[model samples]
Target: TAQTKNTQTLMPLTERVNVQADSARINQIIDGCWVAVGTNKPHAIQRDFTNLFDGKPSYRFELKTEDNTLEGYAKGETKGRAEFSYCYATSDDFRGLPADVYQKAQITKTVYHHGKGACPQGSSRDYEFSVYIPSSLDSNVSTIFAQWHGMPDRTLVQTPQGEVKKLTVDEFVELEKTTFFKKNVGHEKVARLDKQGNPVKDKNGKPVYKAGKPNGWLVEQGGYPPLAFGFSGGLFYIKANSDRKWLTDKDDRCNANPGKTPVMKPLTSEYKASTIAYKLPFADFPKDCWITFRVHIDWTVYGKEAETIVKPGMLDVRMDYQEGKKVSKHIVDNEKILIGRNDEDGYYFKFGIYRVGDSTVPVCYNLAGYSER
Candidate 1:
């Protein structure tokens, strides 16, 4: 208890007490429970050293029928869809893919069923999970392992005839900035979201951001985010790449400036991984070993700004062993994210080998988590 008490003080939230990471004691994963769709399928899978996703994988990944490898369920899939791998769940309380909730975000051959279904409104949106990345991960690839998919609440607008009700994809891209991230942009109060909302110091702060001459942040890497942006849906899981460059969509074709905002940020900064803690000091990724990822429950939505992330709804990730011991803290988001469908649906957790390019066979030695809610 003394050791636990001391470490608690170093953490930002009451995480050591309030937030608990995955406890592998149980598996609530219902779907994506696929091991290997190999129908005894040949070369396309792995260990073939010459067959797999798109081309030959620089590395390989094996299928585990059960986790812990110690459980003897650690065997490979012999048939089904061999193009990829993955799994999902909400929590121990809501485990099993058979549940109706699992159907809402089904993944079949990379085609996510994000919009085909919906979770009951007011359902709990909290989530967490674990990952196992082999050190052989390709460094030069533009990879996106996973992301929380969310549909923003649509807004009503006027048509050529009269005011009608419907939110278009174009409209969502513009309006969602304010509805979801208005706090980050510095417009906490709005009568309603429209081009005519109001002005700040002769600046228009609609959609999201201070409407003024593009200027701010005396310290710069203290980078003012309205100035920098990431489609906020509880910090997306992304990989950094030099080619990812831009500010907003470049088609401000909305009612505002076609290419202007609080500030301009390249795609790399706007989107990418925020932690390197998974790497052990003085060591590169191990050639052959299991790496466990632990995501804690304090998922928040503070807009990445240190000042307003006052709530405890942020998510936390770390490298861990199946015994549930921490390797170290990796990345964390200040933003409180809503994990399900638009504004009022429940969300779930997912993790596994998501190869982008090149091949690296990462072994998932173990998987699990912990939670009170």
Candidate 2:
């Protein structure tokens, strides 16, 4: 109890917490709930009591970097698409929670329960929030308005002597830089081997091996998020990528005679894993109106190492366009898909604009505090 008493501090109502290398802040918008990331001074993210939601409080996120401001940015990459500045919501809660009502609330930061709490396998959550996108907002390049990112977990690794070992997330990242991983690129081609870990030879005395287009088993080293919503090419869409089976062996690709790697396949290739999930034409959608989105998700991951048996996940999204006394309801998405990876980490929610850094026009957006149930 003393630990909670010592760590607990009153949260502030209107504070411009500047981004620090350590990223410490007090009085989070959600109070022991969310942390703001990738923000810079000039007020990237701030509380806005003036523009309330349903006559309540809200926040504002802005991206003010111009092409000239981004000059020489992301060297060795195209300037247009490479330039980027983001301010988003993520988990990792802590002390500076709200005071008054919650002053005595003994809240200790736990990744699983705070912020946009962790969405592990079989967990269902509903995230609801109203967003305000200005009419002047332009989408010359694809910009992610929201996303669910896959988190990695610990992994099993086998040594040359067949010794089994558990690898932590940090250890796995270190392994990627080793000479063995670099030589093999985390994938390997190997001849067939017996249960005794010996090469299986054919009648002609030649070793047998599985036939495939390429050897060097391809492991899921991490890439794009499994699910995302964005505005691109003047259309609103949802993009999803899922694989029922996942391969996560870190040493197989580095081995001379590794075993068969798992196959990675999505539910369907149609729409290239993306759909105009929302058929709302940009013309019909009111740019200045407040759109309330209700997203219910059963998060699933693609990995053989999941603590729970791997299973498919589902997503259900609804958007309510409200202006004055009129409201239009639209079904954005309802599908079963792969929502995450096979790591120890679970899926988390992110909002605020994360886009290809090509546009020069500075942009800003408004949002009511996010509520997850």
Candidate 3:
């Protein structure tokens, strides 16, 4: 066992535990160390260790009728999701940071790295887990089963007075409140505020806005994950996005307005470009069964300030399941892919039910045999 920083502990590699064998609560999985649960409602997930479903230990995740919610810090629920992170703990004082405030406002449920076991560039790791999806689960709403998200590089903010300085996380949050997120205009930029500190609005009541300067500066977050596995359009799919042009400085990123501070897109056009997309129909997977998954990822990305110089890597995935009392498997082995971002802080893992929009039907799922290395 590794030395504990105070009473919190870290899990050993390749370790397996019968999740239901102990009296640990759903939030106490991995002895309340490695992973954390994040959902809108407190009772959204539970530990059903005593029920011997298929003689396997697992945690049950349930989404009730009123589970549709957006976290408080976020703007009104125009876009939303409810789920937790893998590398973030639920403890407020864990790792000397406030858990409630960390990664608070985003629409995505980030599996934050938090400087422990992060997958930096050129690193490799393997992950395994099994999920039980009953046929009763709703197939109408799209959900992300797993996704490896990217980290943004250091960002700069140009003041109206032409002073350029590196943006801090706190300043970034404040800017988000006043600018792009001040009102949901459904666009990349928004109108500047009047002396009364109110955003200008159009005749249709939506906020009117423009690009450039203090109004539309580039913040360090808000973009798609590098690689994702999701169930959408009645099919299970794997998708990856990459930006060969990993712009670091303000010049390339905010260069849209010359002689004035430049405007920026939330996710630069380059990063949003999809590199790979593969899909499998619903019939390809076993219905209402425990499906095991194995994943091996070799992380690679473009260096800061370097475009067109990506070090290619690998992404291998395998799924094993019982098909009519017979063992079946599916595989996706791509040896050349981009699976990371340009930030110094690397990638991390996130799983469980993550979906957008509203739902009337209740949903439930189970997970077991979780391990990583």
Segments of candidate 3 deviating more than 4 angstroms:
1-30, 34-37, 50-56, 64-66, 71-80, 89-117, 153-216, 245-271, 324-330, 357-362
Per-residue lDDT of 75 in model 1: 41
Q: Report the C-alpha lDDT of model 3 over 34-123, residue by residue, as the tens digit.
A: 444345353454555543345754656666666655442225432233333445423232346565444541222222333343567667
Candidate 2 has a TM-score of 0.59
Q: Candidate 1, residues 1-373: lDDT per residue as tens digits? A: 5554533212111011000112111232122231222212222223322322224222233333221111111143221112121222224533444554332222101112122222232333333433334444333322223333222222322232433335444543444343322211222233334477553332453343333321211100011111111111112232211101111122121211112221112222233212211112213432233444444443322222122322323334554443345365364433333211112222332222322222233322222231223
For residue 300, model 1's alpha carbon misses the true position, in angstroms, by 5.7
On TM-score, the candidate that comes out on top is 3
Residue ranges of candidate 2 with Cα displaced over 4 Å: 1-30, 65-116, 139-141, 154-165, 168-222, 243-276, 301-310, 323-328, 357-361
How many clashes does the backbone of model 1 have? Answer: 40
Error of 2 at 162 (Å): 13
RMSD to truth, every model: 20.5, 16.0, 12.7
Candidate 2, 1-373: lDDT as tens digits: 4455421122223232222112334453344545554434434556666667787656676666542232322453322211111222222343465532121111111122233345665578898877887777774434566776654332444444544456554555454333133221332335678899999999899866554333232333334555666565565556554433333433322210001211122334311132223434455556776788888887664445433435767777877875557564646456665555555445666676565434545656676657777
lDDT values, one for every candidate: 0.26, 0.49, 0.52
The candidate 2 region of ten consecutive residues with least summed lDDT is 254-263
